[PDB]
Amino acid sequence: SELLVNTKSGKVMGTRVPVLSSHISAFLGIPFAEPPVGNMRFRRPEPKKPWSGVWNASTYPNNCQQYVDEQFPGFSGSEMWNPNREMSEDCLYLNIWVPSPRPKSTTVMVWIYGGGFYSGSSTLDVYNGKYLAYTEEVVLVSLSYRVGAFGFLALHGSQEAPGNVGLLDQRMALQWVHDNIQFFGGDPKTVTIFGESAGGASVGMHILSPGSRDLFRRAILQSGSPNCPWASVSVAEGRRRAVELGRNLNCNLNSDEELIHCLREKKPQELIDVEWNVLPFDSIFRFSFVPVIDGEFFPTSLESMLNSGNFKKTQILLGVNKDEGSFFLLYGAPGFSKDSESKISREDFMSGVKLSVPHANDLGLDAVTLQYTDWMDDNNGIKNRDGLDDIVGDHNVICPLMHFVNKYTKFGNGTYLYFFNHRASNLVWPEWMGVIHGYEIEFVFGLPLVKELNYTAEEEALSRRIMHYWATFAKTGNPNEPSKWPLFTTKEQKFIDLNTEPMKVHQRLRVQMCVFWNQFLPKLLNAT
Amino acid sequence: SELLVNTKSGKVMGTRVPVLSSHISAFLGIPFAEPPVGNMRFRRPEPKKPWSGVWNASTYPNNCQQYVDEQFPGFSGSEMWNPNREMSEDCLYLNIWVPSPRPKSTTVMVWIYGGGFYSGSSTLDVYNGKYLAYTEEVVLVSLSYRVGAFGFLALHGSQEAPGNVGLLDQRMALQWVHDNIQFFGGDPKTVTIFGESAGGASVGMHILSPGSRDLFRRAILQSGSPNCPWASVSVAEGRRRAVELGRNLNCNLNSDEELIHCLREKKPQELIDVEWNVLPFDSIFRFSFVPVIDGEFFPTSLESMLNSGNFKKTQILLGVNKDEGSFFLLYGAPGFSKDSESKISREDFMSGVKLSVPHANDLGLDAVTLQYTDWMDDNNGIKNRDGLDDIVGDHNVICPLMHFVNKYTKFGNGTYLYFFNHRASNLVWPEWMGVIHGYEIEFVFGLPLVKELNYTAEEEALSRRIMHYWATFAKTGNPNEPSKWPLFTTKEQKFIDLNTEPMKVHQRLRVQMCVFWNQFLPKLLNAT
Ligand SMILES: O=c1ccc2c([nH]1)CCC[C@@H]2NCCCCCCCCCCN[C@H]1CCCc2[nH]c(=O)ccc21
Ligand SMILES: O=c1ccc2c([nH]1)CCC[C@@H]2NCCCCCCCCCCN[C@H]1CCCc2[nH]c(=O)ccc21
Ligand SMILES: *[C@@H]1O[C@H](CO)[C@@H](O)[C@H](O)[C@H]1NC(C)=O
Ligand SMILES: *[C@@H]1O[C@H](CO)[C@@H](O)[C@H](O)[C@H]1NC(C)=O
Ligand SMILES: *[C@@H]1O[C@H](CO)[C@@H](O)[C@H](O)[C@H]1NC(C)=O
Ligand SMILES: *[C@@H]1O[C@H](CO)[C@@H](O)[C@H](O)[C@H]1NC(C)=O
């Protein structure tokens, strides 16, 4: 039977799922690590012990313990990102969609979820991998990994909570795919890892980390890059945050051992309830527990690794959305609301820039404000709102990605860059938010091909084109089928817009603003 | 006889001069101070001793000792600014053009020349006051004053070379006009002082200086303002420069007395030959001997005087030209030449910004470069050349004038602002230089009304309109005859373009760039 597969960890039994009036096989909830519970909380993952008998992989697994968004109860725009299965620390599982009949050796794509390293589930309706696996005939895998304090609490020097264990969870899932996917019909020589936001940062992190490089072939980064300002902290900052988390739960703070033991006795929800209290600054687009530059998973600073070519050399496809910042301003800056056009006063603008660059002195805040203010019309609410939206997206997503892509391309074997700017016709979020962080995903997973979701015919066509670019790149290292998406080169820096109209090619994506964020501001903050 | 006038200093005999197929009276070379020669070099001027008999004022006086431009021998573009009479330290004279027949009490305009405080003559063909005096029926006066070391060498504390004596020369000429112009038919209650470049800065300086305020009624500033970065130095800098001038002429430097005595024994040309050697930095748009913030002519810093309203409250008319910087780049920055289009490499751009803001550290130079570079097309020679031209004009002329006009308007009694952007049809300078520093003067003096000069009919009409705006403002405090040039107000900040087409009104002249030069950069240079 097509639904029975034997792996090095044991036998697994999948389920047949309907898709676009056809069917494919799904193997849901396959364990790839021992449950990281009890004394294992905060520690590096352990490989799953093989089992005798048949593992029932007919149903989605639990989601890892995480913050649950309750801002708009019942609103699908926000709830579509919340765990849709029960939460449990026993959550290290992966899901596989396999074309029917079973391929012999086909392209594999592995999806890494990305809610700021503090949230995310492999089971969301928008991550249903059946449409992509079916339409492009690829073996689709979605993994999971611990988020928040459970995956990133870091007390460098301790082996009990060394940090980066969520990244090590991802790596273990990639090790399992490398070692077992051939049994499901996947080609272990041709695995593409892809992810959005923190998943896009994670993808870039495995490209950098020596210990992860050999587990995959190529990579896709969507609105996220390893060097993002919110994606990592120093070991000293990680340490202070863990100590502050301990302080919020009245823990003995005398030694690492005392702190960790205290933290291990708390119910999951007690850690999540105070997680946001440890940020060192009043801020937006900053998350408490994130990867640490530790000297092990990352041998040195991300910038010297990028500068010296210390990273996997292969092909990458990556890009950003037009309004990366809106989601974060809506949820965290004064003057923005879901049900209004959110025109911002000059005062809210200024308080928004302070929130957006928490690490800046007054001179730096003045430099951002001058850069994004139209002084001929400074009281324009729309320009203020939009300027703030660009500050957040440029600083947190676009310019760090552009810096990553120019550094990478100097040593890599092929780069394709995109700018996604299509506002979906059925978007439930307000107009002012534009092309939102995360909203290209539904096109990558082919949701527009399902009629009941109400997309237009041109949106279904856009989805088909993106899925085929992603799968063709995964299979060959080039999104084009031999209108051509041109290679991004050091010299010409070309990229394409991705939307419903004829493909346009442009050059130097947001160069003007990114010279400010990547070269001028850091110099300013460092000199002063 | 119309040509004989009796003054408090004695009788003066003028000459009849032809103008536009008519005639008017001219009283040229009337002395208003004792010659500042010998032991009087560097000292405050002394009032001219009255004379018995008749002063022959039929011919232009000598010009003060100054640097002579020899860059383009015989080229009229440059030579039109050079002294056209013999140079002499005996040069403190004024010229008067009087309508015929002699008015009883008409509006008076007094012109202050302005070659960077180191050059200028009241006798240039472009300053011939007969056209304006005749066409607008005003009594026109042009004064003179010592320039260079002779007028601005400053050794604060010494009474032998206290500094600002060139400004005191201007003041003495204004005192003489106040006391005697009624005899020539001028109204001492209605005197407008006007000047361009350093003359525009000087005008603003008499508006600020308590000791000059009561000598005139209203003021016109053309491409110059008192707070310009090149218009004044501290007493410590003035002192260092005088000491360095002494060092270049092998003077005993033991005391002020020794230095001054040494300097007084040098021929005029020996001082001028080394004048440029005392600048403290490699630079452009910086002059050696300029006014000093001394605690006397200027009671405190120009900025606190501007901020506190410590200045004459009256009406002012002022403005700038479109390409104020070109003259200075041509003469002093690498890559610019008179006979080529002067497209500038990225390298010459950068070396041009260093020259343009000599007082800036590397971070500030980076801030100017980022502000003026189109990073999508950074190797564009034309954009590089034009960006540099704007940096020079914005930093040296436009933004300081805008800062002056916003501070002044808060306390003044009426402000009219203009932007002159007409490229004359017969300009002999290259196209790349645009609307050059100083080239609105010929329109203010009505040169286009003389056919042999080859201007177009629309240029003659532009000239007539500017002369009538200037004279009507001088007479009433409003350029408009009761298409209206609107008042510049704190709130709306309106100004008009001055050129051959229908008047357009705009707001906030170069605000974007001036917030950078007036608010951000100074903060940056001060913090770091
Ligand atoms: O797999 C996943 C899971 C979720 C998501 C994606 N992917 C991709 C698309 C985006 C989505 N998550 C977007 C989610 C939108 C981001 C903001 C959620 C934080 C709310 C709780 C904290 N509230 C405040 C106080 C703390 C600081 C702070 N900081 C802020 O930036 C905003 C609010 C606040
Ligand atoms: O009454 C007057 C007299 C002259 C002028 C005007 N008005 C108004 C219109 C302009 C004209 N003067 C413009 C004149 C154009 C400005 C430059 C003349 C300086 C040349 C000598 C010094 N050569 C170099 C070395 C020293 C530093 C340095 N710095 C520089 O900014 C340029 C060159 C150099
Ligand atoms: C597989 O496990 C799920 C768990 O709820 C259950 O629905 C299904 O009956 C199981 N099938 C087998 C063969 O155990
Ligand atoms: C990638 O590598 C191959 C072989 O190593 C080389 O021939 C090719 O030119 C490279 N492609 C790019 C875009 O660098
Ligand atoms: C006036 O002085 C000038 C000086 O050159 C001379 O040309 C003219 O003859 C003089 N006239 C009288 C009346 O002295
Ligand atoms: C100027 O002053 C007069 C009288 O002192 C006043 O009535 C008038 O409004 C003022 N004009 C401006 C533009 O301030």
Encode burial over A309-338: b for 16+ CB neighbours within 10 A, e otherwise.
Answer: eebbebbbbbbbbbbbbbbbbbebbebbeb
What the block records as the tokens of A191 is 């695995």
- Kindly give the distance from the C-alpha atom of residue A167 to the centroid of ligand 1, in angstroms, as a whole number: 20
Q: A515 to chain B, minimum CA–CA distance in Å?
A: 8
Location of structure tokens 């440059």:
B78
For residues A370 and A373, give the distance between their C-alpha atoms in angstroms, rounded to a whole number: 5
Question: Of B154, B160, B114, B396, nearest to B292 (Cα)?
Answer: B154
Q: Which residues have C-beta atoms less than 6 Å from ligand 2?
A: B 81, 113-115, 119-120, 196-197, 276, 284-285, 327-328, 331-332, 437-438
First to last CA, chain B: 68
Closest residue by CA, ligand 6 atom 6: B413
User: Which residue of A363, A507, A520 is in closest CB contact with B523?
Assistant: A363
- The CA-based angle A394-A399-A401, given to 5 degrees, is 120
Q: How far apart are CA B144 and CA A363, in angstroms?
A: 45
CA A416 to chain B, closest CA, distance in angstroms equals: 19
Taking the CB of residue A460, how many other CB atoms lie within 10 A of it? 18
Instruction: Please state, in angstroms and rounded to a whole number, the distance separating the CA atoms of residues B186 and A72.
Output: 79
CB contact under 8 Å between A376 and B511, yes or no, is yes
**In chain B, what residues touch A375 (CB-CB under 8 Å)?**
508, 511-512, 515
Number of CB atoms found within 10 A of residue B310's CB: 15
Instruction: Give, as one character, the DSSP assignment of residue B63.
Output: B
CATH code for the domain in which residue A461 is found: 3.40.50.1820
Between the CA of A401 and the centroid of ligand 4 the distance, in Å, is: 23
DSSP 8-state secondary structure symbol assigned to residue A305: H
- Cβ atoms of A416 and A314 within 8 Å: the answer is no
Structure-determination approach? X-ray
Measuring CA to CA, how many Å separate B493 from each of A379, B406, B496, B503, B505? 15, 8, 10, 16, 10
A526 interfacial to chain B (CB closer than 8 Å):
no
**Cβ separation A376–B512 shorter than 8 A:** yes
Strand A218-222 relative to strand A186-196, pairing: parallel
| B511–chain A Cβ distance below 8 A for any pair | yes
Q: Which residues between 355 and 414 in chain B have a beta carbon less than 8 angstroms from any beta carbon of chain A?
A: 361, 363, 366-367, 370, 374-376
Nearest CA, atom 24, ligand 2: B332
For residue A414, the ligand 4 atom closest to its alpha carbon is 13
Give the amino acid at A162: P
How many angstroms separate the CA atoms of A80 and A77, rounded?
A: 6
Name the domain count of chain A: 1
For residue B98, the one-letter residue type is V
Name the residue at shortest CA distance from atom 2 of ligand 5: B56
Q: Is the CB of A56 under 6 A from ligand 4?
A: no
A440, A321 contact by CB (below 8 A): yes
Nearest CA-CA distance, residue B499 and chain A, Å: 23
Is residue B488 within 8 A of residue A338, CB to CB? The reply is: no
What six digits make up the tokens of A253? Answer: 């703070």
Q: Report the separation in Å between the CA atom of B13 and the middle of ligand 5, taken as the mean of its atom positions.
A: 10
Cα three-residue angle A66-A71-A77, rounded to 5 degrees: 90
CA Rg value for chain B? 22
Distance from CA of B442 to the nearest CA of A (A): 32
Strand runs labelled E in A301-340: 316-321
Q: In the numeric block, which tokens belong to residue A388? A: 């703030």
Q: Whose CA is nearest to atom 23 of ligand 1?
A: A332
Q: Which of B323, B317, B286 minimizes the C-alpha distance to B418?
A: B317
B428 in contact with chain A, both atoms CB, cutoff 8 A: no
Ligand 3 atom closest to Cα of A13?
A: 13
Any chain A CB within 8 A of the CB of B504?
Answer: no
Residues of B in contact with A527 (CB under 8 A): 361, 363, 528
Residue A89: how many other CB atoms lie within 10 Å = 17
Q: Report which DSSP code applies to A517.
A: I
The number of C-beta contacts closer than 8 angstroms across A and B is 49
Cα(A208) to centroid(ligand 4), Å: 20
CA atoms within 13 A on the CB side of B197: 24
| Alpha carbon nearest to ligand 3 atom 5, residue | A59
Residue A308 token pair: 């010296």
Q: Whose CA is nearest to atom 7 of ligand 6?
A: B413
User: Do A366 and B520 make contact, defined as CB atoms within 8 angstroms?
Assistant: yes
Share in percent of chain A as helix, strand, coil (round to 5) = 40, 15, 45
Say how far apart CA B161 and CA B242 lie, in whole Å: 10
Judge residue A167's burial from the number of C-beta atoms within 10 Å of its C-beta, 0-12 exposed, 13-18 middle, 19 or more buried: buried
Residues of B with Cβ-Cβ distance to A515 under 8 angstroms: 370, 375
Name the residue type at position B56: N
* Parent domain of A325: 1-528
Of A289, A327, A324, the residue nearest A66 (C-alpha): A289
Strand residues in A79-173 grouped as ranges (E) = 93-98, 106-112, 139-142
Ligand nearest to the CA of A282: 1
Indicate which residues of B carry an active-site annotation.
197, 324, 437
Which of B370, B511, B527 is facing A363, going by the closest CB pair?
A: B527
To what resolution in angstroms was this structure determined? 2.2
Q: For chain B, what's the residue count?
A: 528
Nearest Cα neighbor of B307 from B165, B434, B404, B196 is B404
DSSP characters for B352-368? HHHHH-TT--HHHHHHH
* Residue to probe by mutation, ligand 4, list A314, A413, A494, most atoms within 8 Å of CB: A413
Distance in Å, CA A287 to ligand 1 centroid: 8
> Which residue in the set A374, A512, A519 is minimally distant from B376, CB to CB?
A512
